[PDB]
Design a protein around this ligand. Sequence first.
Ligand SMILES: O=C1CCCN1c1cccc(NS(=O)(=O)c2cc(Br)ccc2Br)c1
Length: 127
Amino acid sequence: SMNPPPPETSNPNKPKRQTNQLQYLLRVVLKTLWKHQFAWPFQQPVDAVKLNLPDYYKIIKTPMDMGTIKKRLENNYYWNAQECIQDFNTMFTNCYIYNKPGDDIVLMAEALEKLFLQKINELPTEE
Ligand SMILES: O=C1CCCN1c1cccc(NS(=O)(=O)c2cc(Br)ccc2Br)c1
C-alpha cells in the first residue's frame, strides 16, 4: 500500500559527468517527451496511494519516472548516456509489466516510447 522513497537524484560520491550525449538527452529527448500530451502520468513517481494501486510496488521493484530523470539530468547525476537511456527503458517496461495491453496508460507509454526511439536514433557521437 504505502509509497517507497523515490529514486535518488543526488549522490555526492557518485562520479558524474556532463557529456554532449547527456546534454542531448536533456535538451532533446527529455524535453520532447515532457511536453507531450501523454506525458503527465510519467512526470512524477507513481503515487500508489492516491491512484489506489496497493500492489504497484509489490510488482515494480525498479520504479522510474521522468520527474526523476529530469532532476537527474538537471543535477548531472549520470556518468554516461547509457545510464539515462536505461532509466527511460525501465519506465516504459514498468508500465508494460504492470498494466495490460491496450490500457490507456500503455497506449500513452507506447506513444512516448516511439518518440524516445526516434530521438535516440539520432544520439550524437560522444565529445
Ligand atoms: O503504470 C503507471 C505508470 C504511470 C502511472 N501508471 C498507472 C497505472 C495504472 C493506474 C494509474 N492511475 S492514473 O494515473 O490515475 C490513470 C492514468 C491513465 Br492514463 C488511465 C487510467 C488511470 Br486510473 C497509473
